[PDB]
Enzyme design. Structure first.
Site, PDB file in Angstrom:
ATOM      1  N   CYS D 148       0.426  -1.364  -0.045  1.00 20.99           N
ATOM      2  CA  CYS D 148       0.136   0.238  -0.221  1.00 20.99           C
ATOM      3  C   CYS D 148       0.835   1.468   0.055  1.00 20.99           C
ATOM      4  O   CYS D 148       0.880   1.762  -0.790  1.00 20.99           O
ATOM      5  CB  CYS D 148      -0.794  -0.372   0.914  1.00 20.99           C
ATOM      6  SG  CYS D 148      -0.024  -1.013   3.038  1.00 20.99           S
ATOM      7  N   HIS D 175       1.977   5.889   9.672  1.00 22.07           N
ATOM      8  CA  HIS D 175       0.716   4.642   9.194  1.00 22.07           C
ATOM      9  C   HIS D 175      -0.149   4.401  10.589  1.00 22.07           C
ATOM     10  O   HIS D 175       0.306   3.746  11.829  1.00 22.07           O
ATOM     11  CB  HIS D 175       1.852   3.690   8.554  1.00 22.07           C
ATOM     12  CG  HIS D 175       1.289   2.932   8.162  1.00 22.07           C
ATOM     13  ND1 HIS D 175       0.588   1.971   8.702  1.00 22.07           N
ATOM     14  CD2 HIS D 175       1.671   2.671   6.896  1.00 22.07           C
ATOM     15  CE1 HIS D 175       0.266   1.141   7.739  1.00 22.07           C
ATOM     16  NE2 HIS D 175       0.815   1.455   6.677  1.00 22.07           N
TER      17      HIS D 175
END
Ligand SMILES: NC(=O)c1ccc[n+]([C@@H]2O[C@H](COP(=O)([O-])OP(=O)(O)OC[C@H]3O[C@@H](n4cnc5c(N)ncnc54)[C@H](O)[C@@H]3O)[C@@H](O)[C@H]2O)c1
Ligand SMILES: NC(=O)c1ccc[n+]([C@@H]2O[C@H](COP(=O)([O-])OP(=O)(O)OC[C@H]3O[C@@H](n4cnc5c(N)ncnc54)[C@H](O)[C@@H]3O)[C@@H](O)[C@H]2O)c1
Ligand SMILES: NC(=O)c1ccc[n+]([C@@H]2O[C@H](COP(=O)([O-])OP(=O)(O)OC[C@H]3O[C@@H](n4cnc5c(N)ncnc54)[C@H](O)[C@@H]3O)[C@@H](O)[C@H]2O)c1
Ligand SMILES: NC(=O)c1ccc[n+]([C@@H]2O[C@H](COP(=O)([O-])OP(=O)(O)OC[C@H]3O[C@@H](n4cnc5c(N)ncnc54)[C@H](O)[C@@H]3O)[C@@H](O)[C@H]2O)c1
EC number: 1.2.1.12
Lengths: 333, 333, 333, 333
Positions: D148, D175
C-alpha cells in the site's frame, strides 16, 4: 519466599515488580515465547506503568534485577520446567492456559510445591484477599486468586451485604482493553465481538466475576450476575453495581460503611475517595477496589448504584503477592 | 418546511444533512463563529460521518447545497437574527445556550414562528418521537426534542413499562465524547471530572436523561435515575438499564416485546438486533434506540439489565426533522 | 529564586512540579479561570504524569505544596497582578497570550523584574539551554525559552552542524495532541485542520520551530524549515530531520558524535539511546532531546534522516527552571 | 473474472467488496480460521468501512452475497485448495504468508491459473497500476501488487522524476495500525517496537516501500529509502517525501505537474487536493495516492517535502481488482 512465575506477560512481569516492591523473592521465570534478552527489554520498558527504575540485565544466562539473579527457562510444556532445579516452591501461573487443577498440576512434574492460578479456575479454590483468606487450608495445592473484577467486586459486595444485605444485584464493568483483543477487526472465533477493533469500539463482553463472588462469599451465591463493556483505554477499569438492599438506608450510610471498612478490616484492599477522580488517577494504585463516593447514586432507600475503581493489572499483581505471603505464613505456622 | 438553524455545530450541521436526506427545506443558518467559507468546509468534511456527497459552495453570500440556496447570518444575539428576511419559520435552536422558553423566545423578535430546542429545556414541553407526540398542540410555540440519551431510553422504557411495569430503574449510559470535553487536562470549573483529558480517561458524569423520561412518560416520574461514563470514542453511545419489573417474565418475553414494538408503533424509532454488534456498527444509524438482544441479562423474573445503542449525533438529528414534520402537520390540519 | 507563574495550565503546573523537583522556589501563581480549590485538584491530579506525591492543600487563601505556601491571584489583566506584594521577581509567562515583548511587559505594572515567555516570542530573545545561553545579557528583561520542538531540534542540529555542516534540512515533527485541539470537529477559524477531531485524525499542522533554530544557531538561519503532523497520543513527540550534510560521513560517525555530545557539553539536554524505544518510554523524561540511534537511516554519505524524541510538556518545563537558574546566576554574579 | 481469494482478512474481505463494486466476479474464498457463518458476520460488519449494504447469508455451504454464490474452503495448505472445483482461476493471495514464487506456486496444484500476491514479493514481478502495467506479460504466472505504501509513493515519485529528476529522497510514512500490532505490550520477537501497545504509542518501524519503488521505476533504484512511524489511528496513512531534485523549480511547478498527471495518465490512481484535509477525509477513498498541495513545503529550488495520503486498506483493494482486470485483458487479446 521462593516464588517462580510461569508466563512473563502483563501479569507475570508486574507480579515480579510487585514482589520486588514488597520484598518477596522470585527465583525463576518461564516463557517459551520470550528469550532472555527480550525479557530484559519487556521488564524494563512498560507503556502503562513506566520504565523499571533500577538495573535489569542478562548475566550468565540469568535475568538479574537489582542484584537478584533469576533463573530463566523457555519451556512450552509445564511438565518440563525444572522448578526444583531453580529452588522455586510457590509458582504463579500467569499463562492464561493452565487454569484447571488438572492443567496447573503439570507444575508438579518439575518439583513445585504450590500453584497460585492468576485467573478464575474452573475447580481450584478461589481466594480474594480481605474477604475469604481464612478459608485457605494448608492441604490446598492449586489455588486461584480469581479475576481482577472479582477482586474489585467482592470487597464492596462484602461491606454492602454485611451492613444492609444484598437481596439481588447486577453488575457492569467498564473495562480497559486486554491482550486478547485485536487492533483492527480480526478473528476471535470464541467471541465474535471480542475480535472487533479495540480502539474503535465499545464492545459488549461477558464476565464471570459477579457469579464468582458467590463462591468467595457463599451467602451471595446466586444473587449477583453482570456483564462487561470493553472500551479503548489501556488500563484501569470500573465496576458499576446496581443493588437491591434488604435494609432501608441512605447513601451517607453506604459511604460511612465503606469508609469504616477501608480504615480497618479491608485496609489496603478497599480504598475510599470523595475526590473528582477519573480512571488515569488509579494507574499504579495498589488496592483491589476504590469506592468512589461522589459518583454513586441512590434511587430509593433500598435501590442504589455504587462505583468502584481498580487498576486491573497492578492491584491484582500486588494481591498475588499477598495471597502468597499469607499461604506461606499459614504453611509456616 | 422553512426551517432556520441557529448554531452550526455537530447537531446544527447534521440536522442540515438529515433535512436534505428527508427532503425537508432549510432556508437559513446562523452562527457567529463560522464565516460562510468556513461553513462550506465544515459541512463538506465530517470525520465521523464522511464527506458530504453533493455540491457545497459559497455563492453570492449564501451557502448553496445541492442547488439550494441558504441565507447565512452570523449574529451573536438571537433577537437580532432577521429570520423573516430569509423566510425561516421553524427554528432549530442548537447552540446549547438558549434552552429555556425565556431565552429561546428571543427568536420571535426576528419573525420566527416556532422554536425547537435541540436539548432538554427546564420548561419548554419535551417531546420524544414514537413516545408522546400526541401531546403536541399548535399553540405550543417553543418545544424541546429532549436529549439523545432520553431519545434512546424513553422508547425502551415505554415498552418495558407497558408490558411488565417498571417499579424502579437505574440507568448508566457509556457515552462517546462530545464537544464540551478537553483534549488534555484543562479547566472545566463547573465539572471537574469533565475537564480531564478525554482520550485518556473513563470519566464519570451526570445525566438528566432518566429524570427527563419521567416528564415524557408521566407514569415513570420519580422511578428512574442514572449517570454517564464518558469513554474515548468519537460517536455512538449505549444505555445500560437495570430495572426491577412488576410482572414476572423471562428474557424471551422482553425480546419478543421489543421485536413486536420495533415492527409496529415504534418502527423507525426503536430497532432490534440479535447480532454480535459493537458501537461502530451504529455510526450513521437513523433509529433512536437499537435493542441489543444478546447483550442483556436477566437475574430473576423481575430484575433484568437491558442494553440499547444510539448514534447520539445522527439518530437525534433525524428526530429533530421528524418532530418538525409532525408539528407542521398539526399546525396545518 | 522567587519565581511567579502566570497561567496554571499544562506548562504552568509542570513548571511548579519541576521547580519543586529541582529545589527552585515559586512564591506566586495567577490564573483567572482557576479558583484556589480547583488549583489544588489540578495540581494534585494529572492524567499524563500521575498524581503529585506529597501534600497539596488550600490554607489561608494560599496554595501550600509540601510546606511551601504560594500566594494565589486570579487576575484577568497582567497589569493588575501584584508580583511585588507576593515577592515574585522572575515571572514565567505560561498563558499562550502575552508572548510579544509589548504584551509580556504588562507584568512590569505589578513589580516583576524579569519575564520568561514559555513559547516562541515574535521579538523577545529566544534561548535554548545547552545551545545559546551565553547570548544572555543581564539587560534582557523579557526573554523566551522558545518552543518545545525548537528545544528538541536545536541540540541535534548543533551537533550535526558542528561536525558535518548542515547545508539544508527539512523537518517533520510527529506531535502529540495539545489543548488548542478539539475532541470532535469544531471551529478553529485560524487553523481549519486544527479543529478536526483530535482522537480520530492525523492532522497536518505548521510549526515555526525549524525556522526559529535559525535564531538560536545563527549559522543555520535560512537553512531549515519543516511542518508537523498532530497524532492521537496525549504526550511525547518526535522530530524526524532529513538533512543534507556538507561532509561525507557514515551513520556510525553521526551516532558517535551524538553520544560524545550527550556525555559532555549537552549532558542533561541531549540524551542518547540504542534501545528499541517507543513514545511512552519518554513520558516524564527530563532531557530536551533524545537521539534514537536505531531509528535513523542514512541514504548516502551526505543525506540522512535523524530521529529525536522529546516529552513536549515535561523536558520543556524543566528547561524553564534551567533558564531561570542561569539568568539568576548571571544577574547575581 | 473467476477470482478466488486466499485469506479473508482486512485485505481479503475488502477485495470482495471492491470486486462487487467494480462488477468483478469472485467465485471462491479460502480461510482456515473463519468458518462460513463467521465469514457472513465479518464481511457484513466493518468497523472502519461501514456495514455492507446488501444481503449476505450462508446458504447451502456457500457464502451468498447479493445473489452471488461463493464456494468456501477452510484449507490450511495452499496445495490442498480445490480451486478448479469452484472454477477459480485468478487467485488473490492475501494471507501474507505465501509471498514468494515458491510458496505462492502451491496454488497451481489446485488448478489455479494466475496468482496475485497482495504484498511485496522477494521475487515475483511487482506492479503498481498507473506506473508500470505495460511490463506485464501473459507468461507471468505469479505477480505481486506491491505494498500500500509503494502504491502511494510510486505515482508521486513518477511525476517528480519525470518532470524534475529525483537525485535522492528519504521517505517517512505516518501509518495507521495494522493487524500485526498488539493492543497492549506483548511479544513481537522479530520486531520489539512492534509489540508495544498500539493505542498508546508512536512506534518507529521499517518499510521496504521506498526500496520497492526502485524495482517499479528502475531509474530510481538505489535513490530512495525511508521508514515508518505507526500511530494510533485505525486506517489511512500519509507519505512524507523529502526529495532533492535535479531541476530548479518552484512549488507551483510541482503542484501544476501533480494536477496535470491526476487529470490524465494517472487519473483514478493519483488525486489532487488543495483543501484543508485530515486523514478521516480519505476513509473509503479509491485512489492510490492523494497529493496534498497545501501541506508540502519547498526549502529551495531543488529541495522539497511532498505529502500524499492513502487509504491503506481500501485504495489498495481496488488496485488488486484493477491489476487483475488488466492481466485478463492481456491474457485474452
Ligand atoms: N490483563 C489483566 O488485566 C489481567 C488481570 C487479571 C488476570 N489476568 C489473567 O492472567 C493471565 C495472563 O494474562 P496477561 O494479561 O498477563 O496476558 P499476556 O498475553 O500478557 O501474557 C500471557 C503470557 O503467557 C505466555 N505463554 C504462553 N504460553 C506459555 C506457555 N505454554 N508456558 C509459559 N508461558 C507461556 C505468553 O508468551 C505471554 O507472555 C490470563 O489468564 C488473564 O486472564 C489478566
Ligand atoms: N453532540 C451530540 O451528540 C448531541 C446530541 C443531542 C443533543 N445535543 C445538544 O445540541 C446542542 C449543541 O450541541 P453540539 O454537539 O452541536 O455542540 P457544538 O459545540 O458542536 O455546536 C454548538 C454550535 O453553536 C454555535 N454558537 C455558539 N454561540 C452561538 C450563538 N450565540 N449564536 C449562534 N450560534 C452559536 C457554536 O459556534 C457551535 O458551532 C447542545 O445543547 C447539546 O447538548 C448534542
Ligand atoms: N503543551 C505543550 O506541550 C507546550 C510546550 C511548550 C510550550 N507551550 C506553550 O505554553 C503556553 C501555555 O500552553 P499550555 O499547553 O500550558 O496551555 P493550557 O491551555 O494548558 O494553559 C493555558 C493557561 O493559561 C490560563 N489563562 C488564560 N488567560 C489567562 C490570563 N489572562 N492570565 C493568566 N492566566 C490565564 C488558562 O486558564 C490556562 O490554565 C502556550 O503558549 C503553549 O504554546 C506548551
Ligand atoms: N492492512 C493493510 O492496510 C494492507 C495493505 C496492503 C497490503 N496488505 C498485506 O495483505 C496481507 C494480508 O494483510 P491483512 O491486513 O489483510 O491482514 P489480516 O490478519 O487481517 O488477514 C490475514 C488473513 O489470512 C488468513 N490466513 C492465515 N493463514 C492462512 C492460511 N494458511 N491459509 C489461508 N488463509 C490464512 C487469516 O485467518 C486472516 O483472515 C499481508 O501481506 C499485508 O502485508 C495489508
Amino acid at each position: 519466599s521462593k516464588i517462580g512465575i510461569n508466563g512473563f506477560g502483563r501479569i507475570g512481569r508486574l507480579v515480579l515488580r510487585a514482589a520486588l516492591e514488597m520484598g518477596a523473592q522470585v527465583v525463576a521465570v518461564n516463557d517459551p515465547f520470550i528469550a532472555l534478552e527480550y525479557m530484559v527489554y519487556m521488564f524494563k520498558y512498560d507503556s502503562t506503568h513506566g520504565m523499571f527504575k533500577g538495573e535489569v540485565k542478562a548475566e550468565d544466562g540469568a535475568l538479574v534485577v537489582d542484584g537478584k539473579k533469576i533463573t530463566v527457562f523457555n519451556e512450552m510444556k509445564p511438565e518440563n520446567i525444572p522448578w526444583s532445579k531453580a529452588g522455586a516452591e510457590y509458582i504463579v501461573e500467569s499463562t492464561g492456559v493452565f487454569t484447571t487443577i488438572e492443567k496447573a498440576s503439570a507444575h508438579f512434574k518439575g518439583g513445585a510445591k504450590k500453584v497460585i492460578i492468576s485467573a478464575p479456575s474452573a475447580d481450584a479454590p478461589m481466594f480474594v484477599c480481605g474477604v475469604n483468606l481464612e478459608k485457605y487450608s494448608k492441604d490446598m495445592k492449586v489455588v486461584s486468586n480469581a479475576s481482577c473484577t472479582t477482586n474489585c467486586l467482592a470487597p464492596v459486595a462484602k461491606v454492602l451485604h454485611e451492613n444492609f444485605e444484598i437481596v439481588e444485584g447486577l453488575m457492569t464493568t467498564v473495562h480497559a482493553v486486554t491482550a486478547t483483543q485485536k487492533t483492527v477487526d480480526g478473528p476471535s472465533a470464541k467471541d465474535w465481538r471480542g475480535g472487533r477493533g479495540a480502539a474503535q469500539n465499545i464492545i459488549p463482553s461477558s464476565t464471570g466475576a459477579a457469579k464468582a463472588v458467590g463462591k468467595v462469599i457463599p451467602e451471595l451465591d446466586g444473587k449477583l450476575t453482570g456483564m462487561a463493556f470493553r472500551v479503548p483505554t489501556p488500563n484501569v477499569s470500573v465496576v458499576d453495581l446496581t443493588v437491591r438492599l434488604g435494609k432501608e438506608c441512605s447513601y451517607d450510610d453506604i459511604k460511612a460503611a465503606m469508609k469504616a471498612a477501608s480504615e480497618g478490616p479491608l485496609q489496603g484492599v478497599l480504598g475510599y475517595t470523595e475526590d473528582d477522580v477519573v480512571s488515569c488517577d488509579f494507574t499504579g494504585d495498589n488496592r483491589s477496589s476504590i469506592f468512589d463516593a461522589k459518583a454513586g447514586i441512590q434511587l430509593s432507600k433500598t435501590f442504589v448504584k455504587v462505583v468502584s475503581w481498580y487498576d486491573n493489572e497492578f492491584g491484582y499483581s500486588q494481591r498475588v503477592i499477598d495471597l502468597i505471603k499469607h499461604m506461606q505464613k499459614v504453611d509456616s505456622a
